[PDB]
Design an enzyme around this catalytic site. Structure first.
Site: not given
Ligand SMILES: CC(=O)N[C@@H]1[C@@H](O)[C@H](O)[C@@H](CO)O[C@H]1O
Ligand SMILES: CC(=O)N[C@@H]1[C@@H](O)[C@H](O)[C@@H](CO)O[C@H]1O
Ligand SMILES: CC(=O)N[C@@H]1[C@@H](O)[C@H](O)[C@@H](CO)O[C@H]1O
Ligand SMILES: CC(=O)N[C@@H]1[C@@H](O)[C@H](O)[C@@H](CO)O[C@H]1O
Ligand SMILES: CC(=O)N[C@@H]1[C@@H](O)[C@H](O)[C@@H](CO)O[C@H]1O
Ligand SMILES: CC(=O)N[C@@H]1[C@@H](O)[C@H](O)[C@@H](CO)O[C@H]1O
Lengths: 247, 261, 247, 261
Positions: C162-163
């Site tokens: 998600e980063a």
């Protein structure tokens, strides 16, 4: 009043200095070379509480109400509001965080109730610094999510009140700091937490260096250590005894 | 005010994790008290009530010195027929069992299971060390040093490393006699190079059961040695050295230790 | 193979360098000056996966299997054992962490299943460094507690996959590091997580700088931001698009 | 291969967060296109279909320049009766609406709600800035700087401080026209001291709606200004200074920013 841990600039060195200085204040006497708390029949009501400050920034800090007794945590103040557990007695309320608006949380201040409220056992809830700084920040920005207020209270009590009692909890904390990684309490820690009263009383009734009732602890690998002696290594895990009787 | 109605009854562990024992389960006055294997379940010839009068009793008879001279044996004797003061005993929170009148102290003087006990002078030998009651099993645990740090054990010496519960080398067994032993070779004990302000704790043979192998987990948070009156300390608070040394109490972080069981 | 974050010695500087270098590897092309992933019909099966190493000490490290596709996380290897989600396809298994013993977790690798397994929503599970180092340590010392394996997987995916996608998640992480305090994702983050596909497709169908269907996000104070333009500030939150079509 | 069957229909926001509007809801060919308040719910005289043929239509008629000279007005005209090329338009991903043939660009030249639009030369004025469609509300958000750091706003200038969602001063409204405005005094806009390699971003009056007040949240992670071709940068990567400066793109951590909405 000002016994405060600054969580900004925390080091293993820093954190200890604190816990020590706290044990210090709680330390009523020595029994067999172990710090016992005070006789609740030696302390008057207006003298009964202590205030610990946990700061995040500065700005940004919440106080705790510590009974001098236990050593328990009756309440915490976050700015111009303070909150008490649903079983603090009338004394905590009149003699603590006065000049503030005082509300009551809908939970007792034992674990089996906080856990009930957090929907999560003591042993799934992680401990560390970042997690305590997350707690100060949370409790300070006053957002009524009871579910969380419980969870984050559990963190604090452990890393502070339980830290005060067991030399075993101090290290586990100090290890986190030096490691910079969170930990959940193992069987070994939960024991000490769950067995403070009965172990306290043992130490104090001790006669031929023998406990009159076997205290039974659990070690990391869920085995039983059954302690019948003041001379036992484990007994050393205890840094603060609840007062039960003078010998 | 803690009452003393209480008179508990426990077995007694000691040298090499053995038990205090009534020879063959026979009780005739005069029968030598030996240091046998700690039997599987709780038998009578191994259990001891620690009475108010300061006597120590199995099956109702008394733990008794033959006489008051260092090297005389302890035996089972019917307490009334027995010489009054020869049957009183005193257990210290430091783990020694003294006889008041004699000033002598209970000690297990040979390796053999079949060994007899004797009153001896008090030199704080690992062999003069004792620990009541019921669960005699050594205390398996990890000793934590500074921050982030634990005793690890490599063959003969020992230093500190990063605390890891996985590693076996970080696991220790503390024995009723006060010895600390690596769960790897339980025939080693942590020992002082010598009785000096400087040593340098090594690992040596518990064959010897010396004063310099009996440690106290003292409640100030130090690991203390009652013969040397000195504690376990981490050289110059620098751990790169792989050295831990006997030194007098300062109370600084470097001298402090945690049982992480 | 060696795209690895050392969590020992982590700095905001350090952590970025990583995420970047990862986006880099995932970055298939640019669409309207936004990095799009590759066409799964441009990549062959033996080329399809990436390995990220997260180290704790050294000793002590676990690998992740990243589909090059998504960007998804099909699997993780912990020593001489590796574990795959119950919906990784046959390809992940044959072409990844070979030479290892391969087991299957009893859960899908979407969130609404991991959450199911963790008995805890995405939004109660805290993120930070210490919490990721706690994760590496855990997953490495192979202790089959599914309940936890889920929880700790959720942490990693977020702080890594998600980063990679949202510039918004990188910062939230970087802020934790610099702050040294854990955080739980707010409405704003969950949105971006939950809306990556539909936002990806928007950007790509864009004609007069206008999305042909309004993407609707939620801001910290649970209000709706409804985005119909490539020109929108928010659109900037997107650092990696799933491929949906060429213009 | 992304199809283009699609022809969406959105309202258009712009200068001061106002809407593009068909005067009084009247459509007779020639009627001036004004910049009114963005009406409460979605009316026809404010909605615009963006057609394949590159025309822009409300109620089926066309968005039209009167003529191709900077300062001529845009009006509503029935597209077939209208001059072919005078009705084609082009919206750039950088937020300007150009007319191909004329090279002129759509711009809102007065403060008043009742203002008419005009084709102008392209100077990248805040007033030449536009942002489709439907939800015209400015985008309320917090801009994050380096690590741990956010823009905070004190009266006239602005610097960085520790990111705190509580603080109001850290909250910004980005307007359809590309201005950034502190939610405190939405009559301010972040502005360049001057158009120099050095300024030093200040806060000034959006009364002006200049080129030096229109910012792009560009997808390389910079806050960019299309007239200066320079980005927002944090002096010498030292934030103690309380200075943020217009500077050319390096791509270093100091130039990078995050919308934390
Ligand atoms: C029935 C029970 O729980 N009693 C235990 C007993 O099993 C044990 O041997 C003794 C010493 O270990 O401690 C007692 O409290
Ligand atoms: C009834 C009996 O003789 N059994 C004893 C018990 O009373 C004693 O307290 C315990 C140690 O605590 O050891 C048991 O074996
Ligand atoms: C004040 C005093 O002289 N009391 C001593 C004490 O210091 C000694 O070490 C202890 C047990 O070991 O018993 C007493 O004889
Ligand atoms: C019924 C529905 O969910 N449709 C929404 C609509 O309400 C909204 O005005 C539009 C642009 O905001 O986006 C659509 O997807
Ligand atoms: C049916 C109609 O005219 N209503 C339009 C809708 O079709 C359009 O897509 C939306 C923006 O997405 O704005 C609505 O007001
Ligand atoms: C390669 C080229 O000349 N294309 C330009 C582009 O660089 C310009 O800035 C863009 C939109 O702003 O439209 C085109 O005219």
């Amino acid at each position: 009043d000002p016994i405060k841990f600054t969580t900004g600039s925390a080091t293993p060195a820093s954190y200890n200095q604190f816990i020590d200085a706290l044990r210090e204040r709680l330390t009523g006497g020595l029994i067999y070379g172990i710090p016992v708390l005070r006789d609740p029949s030696t302390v008057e009501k207006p003298n009964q509480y202590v205030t610990v400050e946990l700061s995040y920034s500065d700005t940004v800090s919440i106080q705790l109400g510590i009974d001098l007794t236990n050593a328990y945590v009756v309440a915490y103040r976050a700015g111009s509001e303070s909150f008490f557990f649903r079983n603090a007695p009338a004394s905590a309320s009149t003699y603590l965080f006065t000049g503030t608006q005082q509300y009551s949380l809908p939970f007792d201040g034992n674990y089996d109730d906080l856990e009930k409220w957090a929907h999560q056992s003591r042993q799934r809830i992680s401990l560390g610094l970042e997690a305590l700084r997350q707690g100060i920040k949370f409790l300070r920005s006053g957002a009524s999510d009871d579910e969380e207020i419980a969870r984050t209270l559990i963190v604090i009590i452990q890393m502070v009140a339980e830290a005060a009692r067991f030399r075993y909890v101090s290290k586990l904390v100090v290890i986190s700091l030096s490691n910079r990684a969170a930990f959940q309490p193992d069987p070994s820690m939960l024991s000490l937490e769950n067995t403070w009263e009965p172990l306290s009383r043992a130490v104090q009734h001790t006669v031929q260096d023998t406990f009159p009732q076997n205290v039974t602890l659990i070690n990391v690998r869920q085995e039983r250590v059954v302690v019948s002696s003041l001379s036992h290594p484990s007994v050393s895990a205890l840094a603060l005894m609840l007062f039960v009787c003078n010998p | 005010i803690c009452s003393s109605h209480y008179e508990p009854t426990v077995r007694i562990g000691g040298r090499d994790g053995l038990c205090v024992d009534v020879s063959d389960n026979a009780y005739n006055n005069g029968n030598p008290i030996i240091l046998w294997k700690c039997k599987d379940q709780l038998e009578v010839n191994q259990l001891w009530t620690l009475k108010s009068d300061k006597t120590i009793r199995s099956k109702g008879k008394c733990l008794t010195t033959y006489g008051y001279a260092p090297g005389n044996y302890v035996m089972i004797y019917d307490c009334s027929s027995a010489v009054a003061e020869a049957t009183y005993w005193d257990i210290w929170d430091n783990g020694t069992i003294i006889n008041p009148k004699s000033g002598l102290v209970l000690s297990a003087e040979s390796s053999s299971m079949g060994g007899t006990l004797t009153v001896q002078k008090n030199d704080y030998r690992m062999r003069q060390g004792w620990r009541t009651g019921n669960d005699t099993s050594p205390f398996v645990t990890s000793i934590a040093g500074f921050f982030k740090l634990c005793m690890e054990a490599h063959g003969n010496s020992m230093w500190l490393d990063v605390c890891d519960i996985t590693k076996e080398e970080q696991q220790w067994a503390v024995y009723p006699d006060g010895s600390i032993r690596p769960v790897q070779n339980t025939n080693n004990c942590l020992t002082c190079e010598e009785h000096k302000q400087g040593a340098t704790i090594v690992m040596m043979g518990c064959s010897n059961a010396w004063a310099s192998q009996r440690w106290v987990f003292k409640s100030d948070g130090t690991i203390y040695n009652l013969y040397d009156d000195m504690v376990m300390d981490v050289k110059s608070s620098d751990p790169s050295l792989k050295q831990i040394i006997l030194w007098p109490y300062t109370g600084n972080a470097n001298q402090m230790w945690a049982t992480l069981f």
